Every structure is written in C-alpha cells, then in structure tokens.
C-alpha cells in the first residue's frame, strides 16, 4: 500500500521526515493497522510489545490522547507521523511543548500536581520492577519536579515554568536531546 503523491508531499512539508521516510512509516503503520485507524486498544497493544512484563496500559492511553489530535478517538496516519516527527526529531522547545500537552490532562494550560501524579503513576506502572528512595514513589517524583519548576509556588506549572525547569535539569535535557532515540 502506498501513499498518494499529494498526501506524502503534504506530510513531508509538515514533519522532519523525507518523502521516503514518510512512505516507509506509512507501510509500517498499515502492516500493523490495515484499517489506517488506530484505536486505543491497538495502541495499548503496541506499548506492551515495547514494554512487556509491566503495565503500560494507562500510560499508553495518556499518550494515545496526545497523538489523537482532533480528539476523535482514533489515530490516523497524519496524526501518527506528526506525533512521531515531534517526539523523535523536534527541537527541545517543540518536544517540551508536546510533553506539556501530555501532562496537561484537561487542556487548561496548567499542569497540576494531581495531573502530573496521574502521568507519573502511569509511568511507574509501566516500568515497575524494571530506584532510589527520594524518588521511589510517583509522589516523591512529583514533589521533586514541583520543587524545581513551580517558581511562584501556586501548585500549578505553566508552559514557561515547565520549559525552563526542564531546561535547568541535565537529566531531562539529556532525555529530550535524543534524535530518533539516539544522542
Ligand atoms: Ca484522531
Ligand atoms: Ca491542566
Ligand atoms: Ca506555578
Ligand atoms: Na521536509
């Protein structure tokens, strides 16, 4: 199955991929999702493929919701390739804007402790028996992040607090500096 020329052209101009790369990703996408419409269950499936033994089910749902840009309940190829482009090849600022969207569950422009607790709980569930005290619970992790990033101590992180606090921490910068998962 191949992408219509005018479609690959558009997706090439909107992502950090070449035309060949867009075509290769379309083929992988379809081999796995012949309908071209990825549902949350088949998304959760794929994360298990990458992260067996743990329980990525909740984290996969949160990630699915960011991929599902128009909030229609399915991931189509245009959403898939754009989310891949930013998460794997975006600049630091673009990656941090995308991560903010992940944590901001209700899309109101802030990340609250509870929202972040929900995501970090979900991450801890995914990894699990795959840590130091001071960071052995999602609660301790969220406390550390808010200590570092919540500059006006109001229990919320704005985009700018999240971006600057992330750029201050070398481990985070290291995680966001990957290109295709390689630095
Ligand atoms: Ca969608
Ligand atoms: Ca929010
Ligand atoms: Ca704040
Ligand atoms: Na291009």
From Swiss-Prot:
InterPro entries to which the protein is assigned, alphabetical: EF-hand-dom_pair, EF_Hand_1_Ca_BS, EF_hand_dom, Recoverin
Domain EF-hand: 19-54, 55-90, 91-126, 137-172
UniProt keyword Chaperone present: no
Binding annotation for Ca(2+) 3: 150, 152, 154, 156, 161
Residue ranges of the region described as Interaction with IL1RAPL1: 167-181
Binding site for Ca(2+) 2: 104, 106, 108, 110, 115
SUPFAM superfamilies: EF-hand
Keywords: Calcium, Cell membrane, Cytoplasm, Golgi apparatus, Lipoprotein, Membrane, Metal-binding, Myristate, Pharmaceutical, Repeat, Synapse
One annotated GO biological process: regulation of signal transduction
UniProt-annotated binding residues for Ca(2+) 1: 68, 70, 72, 74, 76, 79
Family: Belongs to the recoverin family.
UniProt protein name: Neuronal calcium sensor 1
Organism, as annotated: Homo sapiens (Human)
């Amino acid at each position: 199955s191949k992408l219509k020329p005018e479609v690959v052209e558009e997706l090439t101009r909107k992502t950090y991929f070449t035309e060949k790369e867009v075509q290769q990703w379309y083929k992988g996408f379809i081999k796995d999702c012949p309908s071209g419409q990825l549902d949350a269950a088949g998304f959760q499936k794929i994360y298990k493929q990458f992260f067996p033994f743990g329980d990525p089910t909740k984290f996969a749902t949160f990630v699915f919701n960011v991929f599902d840009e128009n909030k229609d309940g399915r991931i189509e190829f245009s959403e898939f390739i754009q989310a891949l482009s930013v998460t794997s090849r975006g600049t630091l600022d673009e990656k941090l804007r995308w991560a903010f969207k992940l944590y901001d569950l209700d899309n109101d422009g802030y990340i609250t402790r509870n929202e972040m607790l929900d995501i970090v709980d979900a991450i801890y569930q995914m990894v699990g028996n795959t840590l130091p005290e001071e960071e052995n619970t999602p609660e301790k992790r969220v406390d550390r992040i808010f200590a570092m990033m919540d500059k006006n101590a109001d229990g919320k992180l704005t985009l700018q607090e999240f971006q600057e606090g992330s750029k201050a921490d070398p481990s985070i910068v290291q995680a966001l500096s990957l290109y295709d998962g390689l630095v």
